[model samples]
Target: GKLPVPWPTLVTTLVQCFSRYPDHMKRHDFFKSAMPEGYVQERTISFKDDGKYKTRAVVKFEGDTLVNRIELKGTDFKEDGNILGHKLEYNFNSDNVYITADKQKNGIKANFTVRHNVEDGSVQLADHYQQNTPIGDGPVLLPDNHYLSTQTVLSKDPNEKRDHMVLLEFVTAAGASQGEELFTGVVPILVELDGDVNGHKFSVRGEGEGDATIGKLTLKFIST
Candidate 1:
């Protein structure tokens, strides 16, 4: 009962997910005006999957390297929405993922706050739900049938430290025990873009295994 932690596959997914913005992003003055000087953007992509594990990731970039911290949380919350706030600055804070983070539930003060009608003050998104797309080949937290899966297939590789495998093994077990399901594996990651727009240095061909999250986000792969 192990959740397939596909580190590379997830990294690949982030790269490919943001590259589709240029053709459309250029039309906006905000994006166009900022392009000359460059900028950085953060993205919180929430999606649906079959297994029941509540997993998340934080991605960052180095000169030519990408590092990510993926963790299986201790509790499950609404699995299909972004952790949005009034603005981007207050958005997607790591602490908000805790199942208890929304302690102000049913109130505007909660992290799950919704808009309200100006006239009657009725809450927005009152009952509406997000239609999260499935990550066809993302991590599988748990399953009914049972199997195994990774990023570069991190599991069982001699290159990986015992702690990495050991940590993920318990993560899967804990994610399952934290709440509700049985468990499961990893699969292919799709890529469709190439290049980067570092905080300021934009290049059509920059580095391999690029990192993106500027104004918007996916899309990826390059050799140099």
Candidate 2:
């Protein structure tokens, strides 16, 4: 059954959301397509192993339906071999919520929660993470603190069978403190999507490795 939630109407919601952000956060270059085809935005991302971890993703109106696919590279967490849950916690911000299913070689099955800010009139999408195990155990702080979480790539070019692909890089120990402090963390997540918000065609497919972390990741937007 198709769900009905305000702000999830796709482009109309994005246009509104984008309008609320500050200039420094709008970094994408955009332009118009045909007569009624709204606006278009596009960018690329890549991945390489044994370094750090990063990821990118996008959201768009898919032929007036569906979402998009994404990819992320760079990997690490030590020889600890923790569940994707204990390894890293992912976060994103959107006005709506959709049912989710994950893909990967590792056994990563987790549910996400949306905290609604009734005052701000928006919601924050994130995982129920806690600091434990290898470090503390019965839970310490909400892990992934001081996250560089952010996005730049917005929509993608119309689907020729691809969603906006963005490669995210998660860096550890940005502020490498002393003692057993070991490392500090912050990862920048880039959001990528196909620009199908135009015309009357809205559809996107999910079939790629995806990351959901980011940095201060400031980006801006403009159209012609």
Candidate 3:
């Protein structure tokens, strides 16, 4: 039986709903050839504490399996009962990491909400964290009552196989204390793409509001 529209065309139209303009076009081109058999990514996340403390993570993906090793760097913080270093492994096809817990055997866990289409090769991964402490059940908050969340998306390129886009957002209280705003600051969003892609260099630069829990104020897409 035939329908009003072809299945392939319907799928393409649906995939476009999540696509973001020129960046999506670029990604599609880069990833068209073939998925990387394996690769390693190194990332450093710094805080506002005079840049004295930071989290360094190394992630490796082989075939459909992924592994991440994280370490804390700096002397301002003590490692006693802290997560000095930790390792986790999981399959890319899955929606969450396989192992998520601190050195203290706490019930804290990291969950990933992934949307991937094997038919069209579009992928989106969201990272979320939660705590299962005896005292209560809620999201694990950072110092200053803040939380960090990240999302990454991959799109197909016309000439190549795919290109990637990354988004980093910080969630914190928007209200004030003693008539003074608790969170009044600007968080920079930076996106950089290295290596040769279609004989062109990819880069991104911009600024946006840092308030509100959602909408433009909350979500930011780093584009190139």
Candidate 4:
């Protein structure tokens, strides 16, 4: 079979696997102990025709895991940062292989999910949804099977170009109303986040493609 996945997805899946390896986790835990402190990262984003903006993030670790509280402060359409959006907090727990985000301004809240290779070692996306409730009081909504399907297939090896690929697919479980298509296509991007010795270094990258509005969105962790 001609590789059935996109390169970016393959790279991401493999990289994440490496992160949970016993060796990598040992080093990560040690680094946290030595630092005994948190750090902040700042970067400037220059979007085409969107002007320049400032992005800042604060990263801390709970136990041996990472906790990120990030915010984007800038003028979008020349207005205050209120419209800028925020990721109140993101926690990474190696045990579950998933990252959860805090309450979203939109009708979505109590968002939590987990990612893992299916029994066949194929990448899968699954999560629970807590829709808004009346009187702001209600029992926790159960997990919705809506997105519980195989999203892509990844390879542990890189291609001839030294680039990794991941094959993207939308299983039937992905709810699509009549006469509706899930996606036309997808594009993936690879990025590097951290670099250093002591095995504490890492990189951040993600996959993006399709129409300017929506498609597939993936952020991967890479190891050196």
Candidate 5:
């Protein structure tokens, strides 16, 4: 079977999976620790057309609970390759989204609140600065049954090619069910020195008893 979209498309689609259905993420400790009980975090890093890069991480925590502390430490780089050490901290409460940034050398201490509508799935960022907002609708998270249901093409950088074998694993349960099942298998998706390869071959080799309800689902890509 041919893939419906390119490799990057499948990557973003999986990201959309995490965005729409955070329950799949909360099953992991990393996401569970960083996000609230019913919220998901969306993180992105991109280089602008002007050769500058920006990184952003956002998580929506529902309900009115006091935000005891939030801290971020990182290096902010300028267009000229100059770097500035920065640290930011915030403490607040409300059903509102809070944002803060350390004072930059450009004399900017970014801070604001964006109203997030849970029902309509809309975000309104404060307008104190100009910005290029993201457009288009986000993808929907696939149901558990859809995993491995379709063939997907894998992408690779021709300059960095190699022989590889990939394994995709998943853990899923029905509703508020008590026990969960483990799904493990090897996918035929491959990246070769010649070009991108779409493997119509894939399988779920095994399903067994395990603690799949609350843990990270591990996926491994082994290259030769």
Candidate 6:
């Protein structure tokens, strides 16, 4: 019998994969925990913008074991339609983080790609310094703690029952009175998996209601 992987491990992978972007690093800490023993992560993604559709994928592991995989693919039409896909593949073991890009259709093929497990203290320290820049400027106060109380309903078909409700929260802070003001939102997410093997599919959605001093901001994830 296959041992069930911890849910937090899968959640950690999803969070870290999405948070790898430099812009996201300013407000989130993805890889702060010492990697757990035995497993590794191998991720590959492609992004595109033609004003029609986009997609992305994140694959993770625990030591030498495959833990979880999350993919977000969507299309824009009269009414936006999409899916939240994930594959929990157990019984595979590897130590690589690979990414390959295809120019033909912007498709990327990833192999046994191992992440850099460098032991250089200085380099790690430098990465930390670079990652800490606030998303915005000065004298930032934290977002209200009650932001998580907000919710949004999501559904695929008008006749079909809504599958889930999304919740969101925010963590805000600022630098100097005139410095960059930071507003980072924390969202409780659920990525649902439903697709075929040759072609995978999914959607990324968040729900939150909060007051802000700045312009109204909205975020949508896209992939190639």
Q: Write the per-residue lDDT of candidate 2 for residues 71-158, one digit (tens) a residue.
A: 3232342232221212322223422211111122111112223332222343322232111111111211111212222222333334
- Give all candidates' CA lDDT scores: 0.21, 0.22, 0.23, 0.27, 0.21, 0.22
Write candidate 3's Cα lDDT for 147-202 as tens digits.
12323222223443222222223222110011011112322222122211122233
Clashing pairs in 5: none
The residue-by-residue lDDT of candidate 5 on 16-64, one tens digit each, is: 1111123543332221223232212222212121111122322222342
Which segments of candidate 2 are over 4 A away from where they belong?
1-51, 56-59, 81-224
Report the number of clashing residue pairs per model: 20, 34, 13, 12, 0, 32
Output the better candidate (5/6) by lDDT.
6
Instruction: Give residue 151's error in model 6 in angstroms.
Output: 31
Residue 19, model 4: lDDT of 18
lDDT of 2: 0.22
Higher-lDDT candidate of 1 and 6? 6
Model number with the top TM-score: 4
TM-score to true structure, per model: 0.22, 0.21, 0.24, 0.26, 0.18, 0.21
Q: Residues 98-131, candidate 6: write the lDDT tens digits.
A: 2333233222233331121122311100000001
Q: How accurate is candidate 3 locally (lDDT)?
A: 0.23
**Model 4 agreement with the true structure over 1-224: per-residue lDDT tens digits:** 22212123122222110111122222222112212133343334332223233434443334433333333333332122111111111211111222222233211122334343333433333232323211122121221222212244343334323233333332211211110111123323333333221222233333332221232334333232
Candidate 4, after superposition: displacement of residue 142 in Å? 18
**Candidate 1 lDDT, tens digit per residue, 100-145?**
1112221011112122222233222212111111122222122112
Question: What is the Cα-based lDDT of residue 75 in candidate 4?
Answer: 34
Which runs of model 1 end up more than 4 angstroms from their true locations?
1-18, 26-51, 73-224
| Candidate 3, superposed: residue stretches over 4 Å from native | 1-109, 118-201, 213-224
